[PDB]
Amino acid sequence: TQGVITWDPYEYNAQNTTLYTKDLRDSFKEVRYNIWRTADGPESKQTFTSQEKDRDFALPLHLKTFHLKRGEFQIETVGIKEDNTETNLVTSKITFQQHVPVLMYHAIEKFPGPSDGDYGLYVPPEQFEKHMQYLKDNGYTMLTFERWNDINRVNKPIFITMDDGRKNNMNALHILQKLKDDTFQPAATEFLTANEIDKPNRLSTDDIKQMMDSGIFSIQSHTANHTMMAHSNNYDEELRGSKEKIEALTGKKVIALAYPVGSYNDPAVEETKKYYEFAVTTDHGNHITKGMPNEQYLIKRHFVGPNTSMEKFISLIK
Ligand SMILES: [Zn+2]
């Protein structure tokens, strides 16, 4: 209950910092740091002692000691005076941002086409189950934006997203429901294009109530009319109106957007910012929180489709 823990600024992808303890009224000869990874968690713990003083008990921390695993780390400090008595100083948290892949699916059906959409949109149910089982077999934690803050608090975080709200997405629910067990708790996000709800080949209101009632799905916005936002300025109908339509259906808060076609620019982000906490793109790559401005409205996603080999799929979620 005494003092405060500070550290040296680092960049998002850095592996090292020097953290030091400050503002103690009593005078100490050394400080002991008890540090552990929130995910692993307290049972895994490592102690480092800074006999180093004059420089506020600086400690050079490098993730190599933690095997370069990343995320949130907890720090407990205890001060040892000239008399060898011990005093509990303060608890802190330091975070080293972790990469999170976000997979973009669309239809979970065998291609019947052309019909609705191109072949690239249609992952057969068997392929999708193989992906989901792989995440089950390799200890992935599936997250949605209600749990955004946990990416640095869990092992192997991953977001599984689906765009458009196509009716064959109920096959995805069943696939997830059947893999649901005491060990594996699945979560996914569905982005509805609002004005297509209860249209042919789109999820029904009952479809959504079911997906919502399983505890697996987060229901979010895909715009009202699958509009390309960089080329539109009807923000009100497409951003705000879409959100309120879904919200009036679900009864749950809508906080995330997925730009149709991946189309966006600065004015559309500034307008998205007014109505959403997160927005997701089709920009290729993993997501990392780098500290960039508005970066939570430009989240990078991976395209997964019928021609995605398992080997490549695996390379994506590495
Ligand atoms: Zn779409």
Side-chain angles (χ1 to χ4, degrees), residues 1-24 26-50 52-318:
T1 60
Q2 169 184 189
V4 85
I5 305 187
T6 73
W7 44 80
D8 266 344
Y10 50 101
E11 323 196 312
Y12 72 94
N13 45 5
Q15 296 176 342
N16 83 355
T17 311
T18 294
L19 53 314
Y20 30 77
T21 315
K22 275 204 230 319
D23 294 38
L24 303 342
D26 307 357
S27 280
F28 308 84
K29 167 196 213 221
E30 70 176 45
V31 178
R32 165 149 26 104
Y33 292 92
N34 285 50
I35 307 179
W36 74 90
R37 215 168 146 250
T38 295
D40 270 324
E43 302 286 51
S44 152
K45 179 187 64 44
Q46 303 190 16
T47 173
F48 316 76
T49 167
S50 157
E52 175 50 45
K53 176 44 214 145
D54 312 311
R55 273 234 152 202
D56 281 304
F57 303 107
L59 177 69
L61 174 35
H62 187 284
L63 296 187
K64 174 185 195 175
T65 320
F66 283 105
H67 293 153
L68 312 148
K69 285 181 193 196
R70 313 181 61 88
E72 173 186 283
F73 289 78
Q74 287 181 268
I75 313 188
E76 301 200 312
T77 44
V78 317
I80 303 77
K81 330 188 209 181
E82 309 65 6
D83 66 345
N84 310 78
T85 43
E86 282 174 355
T87 89
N88 280 334
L89 305 167
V90 293
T91 324
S92 192
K93 303 198 214 201
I94 184 93
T95 200
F96 289 90
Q97 295 290 328
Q98 215 174 1
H99 290 86
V100 199
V102 183
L103 302 193
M104 184 196 334
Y105 291 107
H106 294 83
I108 311 292
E109 181 180 1
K110 291 167 312 203
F111 184 65
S115 230
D116 199 346
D118 303 345
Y119 164 63
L121 285 202
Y122 291 75
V123 166
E126 296 213 341
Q127 182 180 9
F128 180 62
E129 188 168 332
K130 183 173 121 208
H131 294 161
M132 295 309 107
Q133 187 99 44
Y134 177 89
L135 313 168
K136 175 176 197 177
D137 291 341
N138 300 260
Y140 281 79
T141 37
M142 306 170 85
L143 298 177
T144 63
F145 296 97
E146 291 83 5
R147 296 230 281 122
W148 173 260
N149 271 334
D150 293 347
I151 82 184
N152 297 315
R153 306 197 187 119
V154 304
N155 261 81
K156 301 193 172 196
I158 187 185
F159 282 70
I160 303 302
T161 65
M162 283 150 283
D163 302 355
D164 301 343
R166 296 146 169 275
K167 217 180 213 291
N168 65 46
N169 275 29
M170 299 271 330
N171 290 328
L173 164 79
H174 308 325
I175 286 156
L176 290 185
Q177 261 173 337
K178 149 193 75 198
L179 301 194
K180 166 155 181 203
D181 79 334
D182 286 309
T183 68
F184 178 65
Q185 180 61 56
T189 306
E190 174 88 59
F191 291 106
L192 310 172
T193 87
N195 295 342
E196 289 188 334
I197 287 187
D198 288 347
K199 248 67 188 140
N201 311 95
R202 302 290 186 258
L203 296 167
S204 72
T205 301
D206 186 66
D207 283 331
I208 301 154
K209 295 290 181 29
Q210 205 169 332
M211 295 167 68
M212 204 162 49
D213 281 351
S214 59
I216 311 189
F217 275 96
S218 184
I219 313 290
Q220 305 285 341
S221 191
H222 198 28
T223 280
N225 310 303
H226 211 263
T227 314
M228 284 175 55
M229 286 316 160
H231 304 97
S232 171
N233 61 350
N234 187 217
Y235 306 115
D236 199 58
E237 189 178 321
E238 297 290 6
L239 310 187
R240 184 180 62 85
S242 85
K243 179 189 104 63
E244 292 182 356
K245 276 231 170 95
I246 301 154
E247 268 176 1
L249 190 144
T250 69
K252 289 282 193 160
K253 326 92 180 65
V254 178
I255 68 179
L257 174 81
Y259 306 105
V261 201
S263 194
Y264 72 86
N265 58 11
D266 283 350
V269 184
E270 292 295 327
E271 283 297 324
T272 298
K273 216 185 164 180
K274 295 196 203 177
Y275 301 111
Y276 297 85
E277 306 181 17
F278 312 89
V280 84
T281 80
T282 70
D283 287 345
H284 147 85
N286 282 325
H287 166 82
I288 201 89
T289 300
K290 327 174 156 99
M292 275 173 56
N294 290 318
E295 60 185 359
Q296 74 281 27
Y297 298 102
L298 303 154
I299 315 179
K300 287 182 202 41
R301 294 200 286 169
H302 290 297
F303 170 77
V304 178
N307 290 346
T308 294
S309 78
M310 186 61 192
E311 171 174 295
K312 171 161 200 195
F313 167 82
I314 291 188
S315 79
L316 293 176
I317 62 185
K318 160 234 295 176

